[model samples]
Structures are given as C-alpha cells and as structure tokens.
Target chain A: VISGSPAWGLDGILELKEYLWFAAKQTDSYRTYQIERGHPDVKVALIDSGLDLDHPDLKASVNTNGGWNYIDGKPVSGDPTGHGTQTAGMINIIAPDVTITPYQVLDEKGGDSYNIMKAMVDAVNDGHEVINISTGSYTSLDREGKVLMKAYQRAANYAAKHQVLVFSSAGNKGVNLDEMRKTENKVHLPSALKHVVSVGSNMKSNNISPYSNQGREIEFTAPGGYLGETYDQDGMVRVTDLVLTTYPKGKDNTALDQMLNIPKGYSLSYGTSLAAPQVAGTAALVISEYRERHHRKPSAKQVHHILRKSALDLGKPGKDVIYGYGEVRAYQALKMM
Target chain B: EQYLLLEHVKDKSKLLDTAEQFHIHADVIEEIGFAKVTGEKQKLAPFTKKLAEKVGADVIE
Candidate 1:
C-alpha cells in the first residue's frame, strides 16, 4: 500500500515495512525525493548474487528483462541466496520508480573475477546510469601481471569513461585496507578502483560498523544498521538493531541473532552490502532532480561531487576513511541539484 | 567446458589429488582457499558440487 507522502497513506505502509529507526527519513531522503519518487528514466544496474524476481515488494520496481547471469551467461531469472534482493530493495526504498536492472554476477558458491569484470562492462554497455556492486574481491595478480586483474581494471576504467557511476561495497573483512595494501601487497578491486564510489557501512549510532573495511578508498558511508545499543531522547539503548529489507519468500532466519520480528516478506541483515545501494539509489534521485531543475543530466562525476558536498559530516569533522564524506544526505544532495 | 571456483579447502594439494581422482584439472591456484577448475561441464558440475559439501568447500560458480 506504499504511496506518495504522509504517514497514514500507502507510502506510510511501505515506510513502516522499514523500521522507524531507518536513517533515510532522519537524513531527509524520504522527505525530499520520496515526494517526486525519482525520474523513471534513471536506470540502475544491480550487479550481485542475483535477485528474487517474484518478491512482491520488488516485482514492480525490477526491470525483469534487462539483465543477465554472469555465471551461467543466461538472463537473470532468480537469486539463490537473496543477497541481491536485499540490495535491490534498498534502492527501491529510496527511488521506487527508477528502473532497476538485475545483473547476477555472484552466486551462493562464489563468483569469478572475470565474470565480475564482464558484468561491469555489460552493465555500462546496456546503458545503465548507476551500477551498484555490493560485492568485492581481494584477489588480483597485479604483481604477476595476470589477465584477470588487468581485464577487471580495464572494465572499471571503461565504465568511468562512459560516465557510468559505479558504487561498490568496501568489503566486510574487518581489516584496515591501507594496512592490507602495504603488507599483503593486494587490494579489493571494484571498491578500490579510482572511479568507483566505495561505500562503507555506518550504524544508527552514527558510528562505523565494526565489520566495514577502512581505508583511503572509502568515498562515503550510509545506514547499514547497527548491532549494538541505540539510544532515544531519553537515553535508553535499544536491545537489537539491523537493516531490514526484502527477503525471498519462505527464507529462514532462525540462525541470525539480529533478525527482527517483522512481518513476513522481509529480513534483517547487516554489512556494507546493504549500504552501497543506498548511495546508488540516492545518486539516481539526485540525477532525477538534476534533470528536472537543470533540464539536463548530471555527469557521473558531478553526482559524486554533489554527494560528497552534501553528506552529513561525521567522525573527524571532515572527510575520514571511516565515515567518508560523512553519512550520505539525499535531501541535501537534491537541494543542491 | 566449464570452470569451478572453490573456497575453504584447508589443503590445496590434497584437493588437487581429489580433483585428479575425479579426472578434473585444477587450472590455477589463485589465492589461498581458492582454485580454478577447468573440465567438461557435465563431468565437472556433479563432481565439484558433491565434493564441495564433502570438503566443507564453497564452490563459487
């Protein structure tokens, strides 16, 4: 029943599906872009573990015929693990009307670096404006001049040159990327690439999630949900917290301790995987707003600059590896547009 | 032809032995806990799928 504006309206029903604790409204994304609902022209490519094409909450938002599975080289039909579904739902939460193309690059078993590379190029070639990759790999043979690393790097550069804004998860390794690069002689690709907007996870408490990787590459942080106590105005910490999003039908949550008691058709999950899509969705909203106000589309670089400038400054009062340009603010971004 | 991406195998050499037993070639040993398999898709799929569970390995497509 989610419709435009007002708490008691259909939109409220969908908003309620998300926890009241979600930082989007608090950060003004809902108050701003939720009204216009974004331009239908803003296309997003969700490259990940595939999606549940039949999920009720996501059915209307997904561009069912727009993407392919990199594993089997077939059109994206279904997701085996439900990870991509959650990321897609996050984007839909902000910009429900935007066309979301699901490119299944990963699977429950794991994905190859080559397939991931191919997916990036294919998404750009398919004319998607925003590419959201909530997955990363620590493998690269740059030292050995291997073909996979080279091919992947070329694809990343190609996307950027084509003006496709790529957003990727900063990984959940719980290690400092700077230190890893120095000692291990490696870095996480797609996320670490120069042109990609590497997103890190932030908590409702406005703190960096413990699992999110930190480094110079992190461009922004968003609400990935917190696992610890969140206090209200009265200063009492809540017992549980996590990002609630659409889950595949009949999926089990008994093993996850942070799982919420929400009604069926949604599940609570964590990690930078959930944060990148928020930025990607906000970017689409920004693009939509930009087109309306300026009568033209903003380049990917322009969108990146607008997001960094509009972010809610956190941590060290300026840009930091942990919080990036601070939490992404959709209202501020759109207002700038 | 098809490929197998494997993870979480504690012993790469041992896993390679097992692969040879199944007539699969372990193409390139990329990083730790990862390997690339190249063989007949029909032959490789069933073997790797079953061996994945047997060795607590994650067969990343």
Candidate 2:
C-alpha cells in the first residue's frame, strides 16, 4: 500500500503538470499516492461532444472500439469543440490506466434529449463501468425538452439497473433548484436523475464556485477549476483562475490563453462539466481496486456508496445540496478498496 | 443584457420562420440553443429579444 499523500509533481506534459498543481489545490495532492493508477478492466465512456483521439496526452489510452457518434451517425474521433477533451484529460490524469471510450453525443450545435438518451444506452450496453455525461439541459419549459428529459431519465434508470455508473454535470446556473420548483424544473437533467451521480463545482480554496448550481439533487462536488481572481472592475467573471487540461493541437487556443493569461495550447476550463469527470475517474479507481479484491463487478449502488462515504464533507455537517457529500479524493477512494 | 430560454413552440419550422422575421441568423439561434443547454446565458444582440417576442417565448434571466 502507498504511504503518506500522493506526490503533486508530474513529469512530462508540462502544461498538464501545471494544471495538476491547480487541481491539487482542491484535491490536496491526492494524486500523490502509490495506489492503482488504473486497471484495463475498468472502462470509462466519455459521452460528450467528442475527443481528440490524436491528443498527445489522451491518444494512447483512448479505446476506439464500441465508440460511435450519435450526432453524425458515424464513429467518434476528433473533438470539434475542446470541451470533451478537457473533461477526458481530467479523468486520464486521475486514472491513467482505465480504457477511455469517447462516445461523441454532442455536435458543435449541441445535442437533443433523444441523442443523449441513445448515447447513454449505447455506453451501458457496451459494458463501460462508468459513463461521464459532462453536458445536460434544464428541460422543463418546452414539450420537446420534457420529452428529452424523460428519455434521459429512462436511460439513467437503465444504467442503474444494469450496474453502470453515470456521472453528469449538475449545471452552472448557480441556482438552488430544490427551491425553484416543486417539480424537476430547475437543475439540469440526467444529472438531476437520482441514480446518476450529479457533481457540482468547488474551488481549490474550498469555496463553491460561483457558476455551480446547487440542489438536493447534487451527489458530490469536485474541482471545477475557476480563474476569475476578482469579479471587480468588470461585471463579468473574467477568466482569472481555471483548471488547465489538454486542448486539441492546431486549434485556435491562443486567444483564450491570451485572454485568461494562461499558457497557450492548454485550455483553462471551469464548470460542473469539468467536475463530473473527476468523480468518474475516482469511481474508476474505486471500481478497479474493488474488482481486484472481490473478483466480480460491483453494482452502481455500491460504487455510489463508496464514493459518498469517502468524500471529504465540505458543506454542512453531513450531506447537503451545495457540496453534496464533499470533494472527491482519489487517494481516499482507493484506500477503501 | 443576455439571457437563455426554452423553445416554446411545438413546430420547429414555425420558430425558424419567426426568427427569420427578425433577421436573426440561423447560426445565432444555434448558438443560443447551445447556450441554453450549457447554462451559458448569452448576451444576445437587441434583435434577439424581438425574435423571442415574435415567437412567444420568455427570456431566461
């Protein structure tokens, strides 16, 4: 077994190492352990826009099989938008050994409920241990959106029954959805589903990120990496602080770097989108160690219990809406194994 | 100020037609739809409200 805290230092991939320092701010250098980095048996599905299969940091671990795109009715490959790559990178960093299956569910224009439901079902059927849905919608205003919400709920329920864990962004609206509507009208869907782990954003300083939505629905909180040092001067929260992660090569990444004052090529991202995958990675570590000891797959409920029980309790005395059970710690999760 | 809103119309073509009246580009509508899902309330140009009003939708403040 590993002793003391995991080292914060990472060699190679300079930009990623820098971001790990920031990630360590909230995660407390939890990555510095002798724990299992990943297991080939623990497969994770990144169900988002797409992933940069060629990204230097992500390519080696990306599983091409059972990976498909719902938007174009084709195979999943390069990410049109950089969002998925960032989320995927966070998971890769935490659990480097797990096989990552990039399931492109969103197009640049975005995805509807039907497409998202289809993607989740596909991920579950393909035997992925964890599916990270870093995107969702507050689907209460329109009939079509409601239909999509129902589809998403069904898919989430299906995952729970089948023992697949789904991790979704709790949303960035910063509103308390539990107080907003008696019905499920406030928080983002799929994440709002009880069976799925809805993750919120918390800063390295232990404060809840301003953009993170809160409610009774939130299952846990993780580092969503923010950058705005001050909301002053400009009413807008300028990119002051952010979680640095992999960006597609040759993309126009300099503008954000110049705008946010971070290094070029590496994108600094914030929101619950970035947080959900951290938990997904932690779950992968837990599952990996659990399977090694038990010689069988653990149910979704067991994984959720381990994750919740292992969290650091950031808000309230017990589980609350803002920070859920608290921030996820990879070291703590693996120790429970 | 910018905001987000749900698609109030049942007919997708009708909403597009209403957006067309205000000369709201299809790309802008696409951007707005994306913003809504991501919870990024876009600071739409003035014409955005006119288009939403034309389509009988409320601005998500």
Candidate with maximal TM-score: 1
> True-contact fraction for model 1?
0.00
Local distance difference test, per candidate? 0.73, 0.71
Q: Which ten residues in a row have the lowest lDDT in candidate 1 chain A?
A: A3-12
- Scoring only the A-chain of each prediction against the true A-chain gives TM-scores of 0.88, 0.88
Off by over 4 Å in 2: A1-18, A25-33, A141-146, A182-187, A229-240, A256-265, B1-61
Most DockQ-accurate candidate: 1
Question: How high is each candidate's TM-score?
Answer: 0.77, 0.76
> How is the predicted docking of candidate 1 categorized under the CAPRI scheme?
incorrect
Q: What's model 2's lDDT at A186? A: 50
Could you tell me which residue pairs clash in candidate 1? A2-A10, A3-A10, A3-A11, A109-B60, A110-B60
A120-150 per-residue lDDT for model 2 (tens digits): 7777888898999999877664654554454
CAPRI accuracy category, model 2? incorrect
Tens digits of lDDT, candidate 1, A225-303: 7555433235553434577677765565444523434545566677799889989988988888778888977888899
